[PDB]
Design a protein around this ligand. Structure first.
Ligand code: NA
Ligand code: NA
Lengths: 252, 252
């Protein structure tokens, strides 16, 4: 049958992304036919593989239908003056010291072409899975980049969030960080989980496959190598906090 | 020919809305074919005619194709607990004093049925005006409710704002509060003007008619009676500050 692959929060973690894409190639040998991909942010920003992540997405988009939308971290980079000489503007932003470091590094490594790529990324996902209209945004409908839809809340919580977008059958968001599939009277609120941004310990690249016909959601978890990411963080001189996030999780 | 009427920022000003609608009816008698209406927020919130504004729209929706989206003020009311006994939460919001007064007034005057109506209002407008896809939001694509797009800026300013929504031919926003029609390489950024929220002195109910085939924008200005609004403000014991905004304009 046919499913739509939904991924989110790669956050510059190339190994996690590669593991996920390879699992998908394998599932296609298992009866899954994947007509298109939805990739929610953050795309880059935390882990040291910004260029490899974008290249992998660009390559996928050439042979498959890929719709990508930017996340908070992507926007913090894209919003900078196009010909800024450095990422110093970041030191004034109200964000943790560790994020300031990774964002600066990302800004630099991306170069002008990488930064322009982020600037071309849409903010909103408006498409249909099957014959069903769906809407997608990084944070929440009320606030695209700073809004946070929490996982583990009662149906009433999700019902109120879905109301403003009740014309859509499904709302796709990245902020919950964990697999979420909440049916409400106004439609379903869904989070595919997190690809490369660990929410806690023993993180596994997580994403979702949604049935284009029935809209049912299946969540997939795939292991990836954290040691090579740890080594890269060290080699690149990034904050120890980034390693702590890798193994114990952290919030956006 | 055929046009789509675009209105924004009624802000509870029934007399202004009535004047605009009546002008539309006159233009129809003059050969203007109106296919549908787009009514961007703020619907209610500042002036004392919340119930009458909603009733006028509802009746319009009965006979014509009308799509409405909420604005900042509408959201501040809709976000409240469905069974709160008063609008006291508003006093703790970081908004000017006069707005607390008018929002609380609006909250109670709306009644449960009125507030529920705002809660059903979509946040985003996604439609086609002919073969042209369009997107609409109150503030800005980056921040739906708090985002502000300025008028009278260089093309480069609007270009950067259109880029994240470049999949659409036209972006409709209310925040500029003045007629705006800026063409960029990524599409046009348009503001129909303000229907009932004066940005300055001698304000006239302003809206736009968009050519359903050429996407050409025509702005219309209509006069309405401010004295009856002033009198209503006084009768309802609302801030003198609202009368000030009425004749000298005020900011959202
Ligand atoms: Na729905
Ligand atoms: Na465009």
């Amino acid at each position: 049958m046919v499913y739509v692959a939904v991924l989110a929060n790669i956050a510059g973690n190339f190994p996690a992304l590669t593991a996920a894409l390879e699992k998908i190639e394998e599932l296609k040998e298992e009866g899954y036919e994947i007509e298109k991909y939805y990739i929610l942010g953050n795309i880059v920003g935390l882990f040291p593989y910004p260029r490899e992540v974008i290249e992998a997405i660009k390559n996928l988009a050439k042979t498959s239908n890929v719709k990508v939308i930017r996340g908070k971290y992507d926007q913090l980079i894209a919003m900078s003056d196009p010909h800024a000489g450095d990422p110093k503007y970041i030191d004034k932003l109200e964000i943790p010291d560790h994020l300031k470091a990774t964002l600066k590094y990302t800004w630099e490594k991306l170069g002008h072409e990488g930064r322009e790529y982020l600037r071309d990324l849409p903010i909103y996902l408006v498409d249909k899975i099957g014959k069903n209209e769906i809407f997608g945004v990084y944070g929440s409908p009320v606030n695209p980049f700073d809004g946070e839809i929490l996982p583990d809340q009662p149906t009433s919580y999700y019902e109120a969030i879905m109301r403003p977008v009740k014309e859509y059958e499904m709302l796709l968001v990245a902020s919950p960080r964990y697999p979420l599939d909440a049916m409400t009277m106004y439609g379903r609120v869904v989070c595919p989980g997190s690809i490369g941004f660990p929410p806690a310990r023993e993180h596994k690249a997580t994403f979702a496959l949604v049935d284009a016909e029935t809209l049912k959601v299946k969540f997939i978890e795939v292991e990836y190598d954290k040691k090579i990411i740890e080594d890269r963080i060290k080699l690149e001189k990034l904050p120890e906090e980034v390693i702590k996030i890798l193994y114990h999780g952290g919030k956006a």
